[PDB]
Symmetry: C4
Subunit: 388 residues, 4 copies
């Protein structure tokens, strides 16, 4: 086993095909399914798995009451087989905490969980299923990380962390890990003014992350990382196709180097694939809430402040709930190019559906096709009324 | 690991012995068993497994209400250990969709799931548990495939798909796959006038499929495929022993090159083994409904339009429900010949048993014996009244 | 991997230590535990497992009603990890039927299940988890076999079957299998007048089985088998310490070559270790019912028609239910001798406890010690009243 | 695989990071979680697992009634994946009994369970998942052992047992095992006057155990073992920071060679790391009950009868229940030093919470960091009222 290297480009994305779906809320209506949120997908060389933050109770369990809260001592990063639900009996605990990331470097897996109180959180970096490095909070304000997979190149796996205000300037750092040890870290550079929850992918020896400016931006910040030099910059997606949520209506011209204004102090984790004409952006269909989800092909979105969609695909109808969304690729598939993939978290329960006392989610995930495939929509599918 | 080659003939079939049975509806009365239908069996070189289409809910779960429907976003091909039930906790998802096939080529497994709306369905072809090829609907009318295992020879695994009307001419294609990639495809040839749900087996470098003419035929169409030349023809089973359902009474003479008339627009998936005097046909015992199941030895059924049974074996009594039935063989068993096997789906719930709001099934499977074994009957065994 | 050979003698048995216990009825009061009976234990070279006949329903399930019956289409030989309970989710199906045996030959496992109606039963012999040989009923009267493990020597695994009356002369055969194929079979020889449910062990190239004379004997028949010559004889245990159940009071003198009279048409599966002075017999404590269980050291029991106990060990109190009991050894342990082991089935429910509608069991198993260990008793431990 | 050797020293302990937490009582409110107590953690070369004594019933099960009792026939040492709960379906039985220890020697695992009545208990020593050696009670008074992992060095794995009074002099022995066989045993030596439940760790070819003087001491006895010479001594922790429970208030001066008085006939299993200035002691926060848990850095605690804390870390608040606590290390981690770890048992139910009829626990475990990490508290998290 050698470290994996990012030697391929992205396949041409002409549509999205179904990859995985776990139906966890439907099935967990009458089986021992854990309450989760903040899910993602990540591949090893011989298997791809679903990941999420457990809340340490099943959904039918009485302890599901109160699970709208983000951060407790009962949370852990869990993983489980692709498209199965996260059950008590099949879920494997990666580490303990309420913010995470995880990636395989070709030889073994690194998993990072942050736990603690808001003013005293710490990250523990696990490598080959043992704890190796720990990092203490630097700004004493909810140390937090990507909530989707990291990416490695020749052993170097950069990770984006943020510590500080959600509604003001914060202190974002890029840590470059290798075998779980810190090679280097840098403070955020470039023009992004606030960073959270970066969604990353790797192609041709470069790692691109699409993040959430929680403070001011409804355009998404982008961090581009060179994992060999161990350097980065940041900017925003130029495109007037705005992809955060909540957000104002789309203008005609976006902003490349500043937050696009109109909504403050709020947002959602999301992603994009930024590859010249082969660029696809994800977003909720609603400008106001986490409902619906679409993919739009927006040629040169990253660099063209007037780019608009040339194609699209509905993933979730606007009459169905969505949530966080994020990128991953199977870096160990055969063939000449990396096939872009993503998941969407389908959040159920509170706050939008408050007749139940819980919040949970299921997962749908697609990967790209070079065909122009017909679309379906992929909702969570559970009837909240069955839980009453 | 080399690609497997079909180098043996069928063993002499003198009776059928019990192979597997999961009792899923009985057990799922009080355990976390998934609602399924469209089951089958398929072997790898070191294990044989049960397969089916999940409905993405357990049977006791409230979401089992409505599961008579064939096609939703909550379905997936799952597999699980032989004769265990498909539970939440032991079932492995192969791919997402509501029509499937799957086979191992000696090196690894190919699995194909079709999903989408009726006018916009697509097939995703997985190989070694990754998506490799996608195929879009060509007639915009419920693209669909075998619902039982495919067969490979030297890496080439043909698969029969149909897109178009269930009650009229449709567009059937034979795709020849290798490592998940399309080597070739051909439109249906020969005299079969409508094809659905082919049940296939392989012997001496030839693949024989027994299919369902949904439009006109109560005799079954047969497709014979040369996986080296990558060519095929089709005809019908000549025999007056008619094997679709519903069907008219058996005549005295069948038809070789046309549908045998008497029932329109309906049928059920079934199979046969067509091997000269060693020929056995499966069918429901009832001409009117999916009840009962028998095997009949009908020497030269394929080519003799007056052949009648010379032996038989009851599998399921006419007072018990049956359903789809299909062929598979363990191509990696030791010994001089391939032992024919089959399963019967035992459908419970709607529409015949409408005091419950669900539809599900369990599975019974037999393989052939060179002995003349005593027969038992093998019903589903659940009491519907326990579910009330 | 070579075939295992029986090259060691029995270790000196000076007491019995606890080996395994699954508590299945206790735990299955509130978890998805299958209804079983006819359990046993058998080792592979790298693992020892519990085996039993499932009834194809959980114990809390409504289908547990009626499970006092011995033979249905819903039964299967299952195995599961040592001292775990047989659950829906962890139990592996070996084959389908309502009478079984199973043993590992050093290279792989042979499992035999008999199914069918009383007048038309057949055995299917599985080897390396595939069906290899089938055998049809020869006397049309409930073809049946050991219900505990077989034993192999250099690939040859003899198995004792009986077909015919339970209350009269029957036709017992010894089949000698190798890789699942029949090398030879012989009709029962020697002085045993009726044989059922043989409990076997192997030492120094000879296999000894202790069986149940259901028709006349309260002393147990014994079959001694030479697996190299493929020959056998039979006699009874001479000892006046009578070990079947129900049974008369112990006399002073037993019988070597005839059934010891006093009880007709009834009995229970049991076992012994017959090794000169190192001989230990198992039996229920009650002469009238399956309650209690003890081991007695009865020097030369096999050949001495006046032998009485020189030591003993209570396994289950007379105020607790027992059931079938049987022998196995770990033939792949390190060391100079084979350590004798046994299990006792602890039957709960009907017919003795008829406030519940089911019958099931749990398992306790001990192996011998060369120390003189203190004894405990090992009851099932469940409160029937919790199930009301 | 070679036997592991204790060739490293302890890493510098500057704080404790979260390692694992199973939330078993929360999750077991509505899933099939076994009732346990006396948990611990132990690593193999490729995996670390949770261990505990099952009570042979789930917590929601009616048989959980009465589980405050320590010793029944329904108990077994079980292990399960790190931070998962001990469920029916994922728990592996190591051996049967109501007192245990377990450790891996680099080649395979040794597990020891004691069972029997109080006056007739015996230990069975399993090695490579087979029983190898048995030891009978020597003082006929509840033969008992560590309840946390043992430690091996070059194949030699010493184990501390005690047989005799809990409230008076007893007979403690140190057995030195290798491949499950007794190399040697010695009676307790040095100044410790009563020993129970030793918590052990190994560094630089020496094994240190921190035990419980149940009879007189609120300071903890310490046994230091040379596994090459196979010799030991014992003394007490000198420090006036007293670490048993219940206990008097901390004095100013402790005792090195006698029990520190003030509480008789009671105590709790606990541990320490004794490494010069790098010494950390665990204890309950309450002097009166098993509530709260803290770690205190007490330089030279072992040898300095006036040492007081120079740092600390809260693990569990005084308003939350704790229980037994114990040491383990991952001896197969990479790097230059062994990272100290520990777990705390979080006992729920009786006797403190007597509105429920059961007693169970969950587990939290930490390992040391060379950083000064922020602290959180880690309670069990279940609401007893949900169980009413
Ligand atoms: C079976 O399956 C297939 C495969 O999925 C289905 O076919 C798919 O059908 C879908 C849905 O109909 C299509 O998605 C839409 O794509 C269009 C883009 O394609 C159109 O526009 C292209 C570019 O045109 C522009 O470029 C230049 C400019 O100089 C010039 O050429 C041109 O005139 C124009 O200015 C055209 O090239 C393209 O045409 C080609 O393809 C056609 C096939 O569809 C064919 O018929 C043609 O002949 C031709 O060859 C086509 O015209 C997306 O724009 C659209 O996305 C917008 O609309 C949806 C609402 O439906 C919305 O949710 C999106 O957010 C977006 O609209 C919002 O954002 C815009 C950007 O800011 C903004 O302008 C809009 O006002 C709107 O904003 C409002 O809503 C948002 C979101 O709520 C909010 O944030 C804002 O603030 C504001 O409120 C869809 O993605 C697929 O591309 C198509 N796929 C394929 C391969 O064909 C098929 O239908 C199914 N079949 C059946 C039988 O069911
Ligand atoms: C223990 O277990 C064993 C092993 O399982 C049990 O023994 C088995 O018993 C079963 C059931 O009894 C047998 O199955 C039946 O097999 C017969 C075929 O065998 C008979 O016919 C043979 C051929 O004869 C013809 O050939 C030539 C013609 O030129 C000529 O020789 C001859 O005169 C005749 O014209 C005979 O060779 C054969 O005889 C031999 O074997 C005998 C043993 O059974 C022995 O006794 C003899 O001495 C001799 O050596 C024997 O006569 C099947 O035909 C039958 O299948 C038909 O009947 C069942 C109803 O029972 C039906 O469900 C089937 O569908 C089928 O009948 C329908 O279809 C026909 C074809 O179209 C049609 O003609 C019928 O009118 C009927 O149609 C109606 O119903 C269908 C279905 O609903 C509907 O679609 C139509 O529209 C219409 O409504 C059974 O399969 C096993 O073969 C036998 N196995 C063995 C190895 O013996 C044993 O009983 C058990 N023991 C105990 C103690 O329980
Ligand atoms: C801690 O744990 C230890 C280890 O487990 C416990 O110690 C164990 O204690 C048990 C129970 O007490 C012992 O089991 C019993 O063993 C005796 C056999 O040992 C006795 O007899 C030996 C042989 O004597 C004969 O041989 C010759 C003859 O020429 C001659 O020497 C002699 O005089 C006599 O004729 C003696 O050698 C032996 O003595 C030695 O060991 C002693 C230790 O116990 C020691 O004290 C001595 O000093 C000496 O060194 C000893 O006397 C078994 O016979 C007995 O089994 C019978 O009894 C039980 C009822 O308790 C019954 O259930 C059995 O079925 C059996 O009795 C039935 O069957 C007989 C045979 O047919 C029949 O004769 C009886 O009438 C009776 O029949 C009735 O009931 C049956 C069954 O229901 C029914 O079918 C019939 O029809 C009829 O109704 C027990 O197995 C262990 O051996 C002992 N183990 C050890 C290593 O010591 C210890 O107690 C525990 N400690 C604490 C503190 O709890
Ligand atoms: C974010 O996270 C961080 C990291 O966790 C949090 O910071 C941690 O904060 C905790 C809690 O505040 C600290 O734990 C306490 O540690 C102190 C020991 O450190 C103090 O004392 C040191 C030694 O001083 C002595 O040494 C010499 C003597 O010659 C001399 O130098 C000196 O004057 C004195 O005599 C000092 O070196 C040390 O100072 C340094 O560090 C400071 C940081 O905290 C810094 O501010 C300073 O400037 C300096 O550089 C510091 O003063 C522990 O002693 C304490 O443990 C005692 O107290 C707790 C109650 O809180 C109690 O539960 C413990 O049991 C113990 O007290 C009992 O036992 C004593 C020993 O017998 C006895 O003396 C006491 O009376 C008491 O006894 C009673 O209760 C017990 C238990 O119930 C009972 O059994 C008895 O019978 C009796 O009833 C805590 O462990 C961490 O060390 C600190 N960690 C770090 C790295 O800083 C931070 O707060 C969090 N931040 C936020 C924003 O939340
Ligand atoms: C560390 C944290 O609480 N992040 C929030 C995160 C943060 O609150 C925001 O990113 C602002 O800092 O927001 C959301 C959300 O649904 O919007 C979550 F799902 C996240 N929950 C989580 N356990 N990781
Ligand atoms: C694609 C489809 O719906 N096929 C139907 C199929 C089709 O409706 C028919 O083959 C006609 O096209 O019919 C039946 C049936 O029970 O008869 C099913 F079980 C099938 N269900 C399924 N999910 N594959
Ligand atoms: C052998 C025994 O009962 N030990 C007690 C042990 C002993 O009673 C004491 O160590 C005194 O001998 O005390 C406690 C406890 O919670 O305090 C337990 F958890 C232990 N329970 C257990 N099954 N190992
Ligand atoms: Ca924002
Ligand atoms: Ca038809
Ligand atoms: Ca008898
Ligand atoms: Ca004490």
């Amino acid at each position: 086993r050698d470290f994996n290297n990012l030697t391929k480009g992205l396949c041409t994305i002409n549509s999205w095909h179904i990859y995985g779906k776990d139906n966890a809320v439907r099935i967990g209506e009458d089986s021992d399914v854990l309450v989760t949120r903040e899910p993602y997908v990540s591949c090893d060389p011989d298997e791809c798995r679903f990941y999420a933050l457990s809340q340490g109770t099943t959904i039918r369990g009485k302890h599901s009451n109160g699970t709208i809260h983000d951060r407790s001592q009962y949370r852990a990063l869990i993983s489980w087989p692709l498209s199965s639900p996260p059950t008590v009996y099949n879920s494997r605990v990666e580490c303990i905490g309420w913010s995470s990331t995880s990636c395989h470097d070709g030889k073994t897996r690194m998993s990072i969980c942050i736990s603690g109180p808001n003013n005293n959180a710490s990250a523990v970096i696990w490598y080959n299923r043992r704890p190796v490095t720990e990092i203490n909070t630097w700004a004493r304000n909810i140390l937090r990380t990507q909530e989707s997979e990291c990416v490695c190149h020749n052993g170097v796996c950069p990770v984006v962390f943020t510590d500080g205000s959600a509604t003001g300037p914060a202190e974002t750092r890029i840590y470059y890990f290798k075998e779980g040890k810190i090679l280097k870290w840098e403070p955020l550079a470039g023009t992004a003014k606030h960073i959270e929850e970066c969604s990353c992918y790797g192609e041709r020896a470069e790692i691109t992350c699409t993040c959430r400016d929680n403070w001011q931006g409804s355009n998404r910040p982008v961090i581009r990382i060179d994992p060999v030099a161990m350097t980065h910059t940041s900017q925003y997606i130029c495109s007037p196709v705005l992809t955060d949520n909540p957000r104002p209506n789309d203008p005609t011209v976006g902003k490349c180097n500043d937050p696009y204004p109109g909504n403050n102090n709020n947002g959602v984790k999301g992603f994009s694939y930024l590859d010249g004409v082969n660029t696809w952006l994800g977003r909720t269909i609603s400008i106001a809430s986490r409902s619906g989800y679409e993919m739009l092909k927006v040629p040169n979105a990253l660099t063209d402040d007037k780019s608009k969609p040339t194609q699209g695909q509905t993933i979730v109808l606007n009459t169905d709930w969505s949530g966080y969304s994020g990128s991953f690729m199977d870096y160990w598939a055969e063939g000449e190019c990396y096939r872009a993939c993503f998941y969407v978290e389908l959040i159920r329960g509170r706050p939008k559906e408050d007749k139940v006392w819980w919040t949970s989610n299921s997962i749908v995930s697609m990967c790209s096709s070079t065909e122009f495939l017909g679309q379906w929509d992929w909702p969570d599918g559970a009837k909240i009324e069955y839980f009453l």
